[PDB]
């Protein structure tokens, strides 16, 4: 729709299928047309490239949607079967320098 989105900050949702390699993106509750198919054993790092136009730019919301594991259940082996989203201290934001 463009323009007004202030009802809630633009929520781009990244969905990864580790069994098929399908990369689908959810934007404000609707699936986007762009999809990426990757090859087996690919290690994908969650990443955001942004140019700062405000003091608050973006936020890594580590959560879950209906019928999907959170990112922690895939990142960590000890939390493989835990549907509750988590953010252990090991995970942290890195920047290219």
């Amino acid at each position: 729709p463009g323009q007004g989105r202030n009802n809630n900050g633009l929520e781009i949702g990244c969905v990864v299928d580790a069994a098929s390699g399908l990369l689908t993106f959810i934007a404000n509750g609707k699936e986007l047309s762009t999809y990426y198919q990757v090859e087996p054993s690919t290690k994908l790092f969650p990443a955001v490239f942004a140019q700062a136009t405000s003091p608050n730019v973006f936020q890594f919301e580590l959560g879950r949607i209906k019928n999907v594991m959170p990112l922690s259940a895939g990142l960590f082996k000890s939390e493989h079967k835990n549907p509750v989203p988590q953010c252990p201290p090991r995970l942290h934001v890195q920047f290219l320098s």
């Binding site: 729709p1 463009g2 323009q3 007004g4 202030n6 009802n7 136009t53 405000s54 003091p55 608050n56």
Partner: protein
């Protein structure tokens, strides 16, 4: 003695009607937010003691008579902004939403919206106009009263940050809402042509031209 930039002659274009709208709406929304924060309630009678407000109905249910004087500051703001010649360009997504088409307590948190520093100088100087308007009206009121002086009547740069705060923040909120709408605001004109190749364009050449002219005048004086 401050003169505000007069703009009574200038008129708003029709393409700015769509901007006049939704800003009538947004100002009504934020005014209702302030009222509900103060405990104002939707009551048909406007009694201050019981805190019942008949203006809580949405903008569409609001009457046009109170929509005037309401739209008045918005009208003068856009009029003055155009009076400098500054141009605003509307983007396609605006008309897309146009054709797309109890009370509603949704408001926009505009604090994190940021303008450029050019837009900041823009807002500062147009806000200086706003302070000049206020100073002119207060000067007229005070000379009519014939006695007194006001501490904030001092010149704009003489005002402090907290004193400027109201005028500045209303300046940014209007220009930021404009930017998020997509009306591309810029200065009236851009440099048609600058004579950079001019050898006299530099300071040194003009200085030494003045110097040689004055020293030759002094020469014919000294001959005299």
């Amino acid at each position: 003695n401050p003169q505000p930039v007069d703009t009574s002659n200038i008129t708003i274009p029709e393409k700015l009607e769509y901007f006049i709208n939704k800003y009538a709406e947004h100002s009504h929304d934020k005014w209702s937010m302030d009222k509900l924060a103060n405990g104002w309630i939707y009551g048909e009678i406007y009694s201050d003691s019981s805190k019942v407000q008949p203006l809580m109905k949405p903008y569409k249910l609001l009457s046009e008579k109170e929509k005037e004087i309401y739209r008045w500051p918005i009208k003068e703001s856009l009029k003055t902004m155009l009076a400098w010649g500054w141009r605003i360009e509307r983007t396609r997504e605006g008309d897309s939403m146009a054709l797309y088409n109890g009370y509603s307590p949704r408001a926009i948190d505009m604090s994190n919206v940021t303008l450029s520093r050019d837009l900041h100088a823009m807002a500062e100087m147009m806000a200086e106009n706003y302070h000049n308007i206020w100073a002119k009206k207060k000067k007229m009121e005070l000379e009519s009263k014939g006695g007194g002086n006001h501490p904030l009547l001092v010149p704009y740069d003489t005002l402090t940050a907290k004193e400027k705060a109201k005028d500045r923040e209303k300046a940014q909120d209007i220009l930021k809402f404009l930017q998020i709408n997509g009306y591309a605001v810029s200065r009236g004109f851009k440099d048609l042509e600058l004579d950079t190749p001019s050898i006299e364009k530099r300071f040194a050449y003009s200085f030494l031209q003045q110097l040689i002219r004055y020293v030759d005048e002094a020469h014919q004086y000294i001959l005299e």
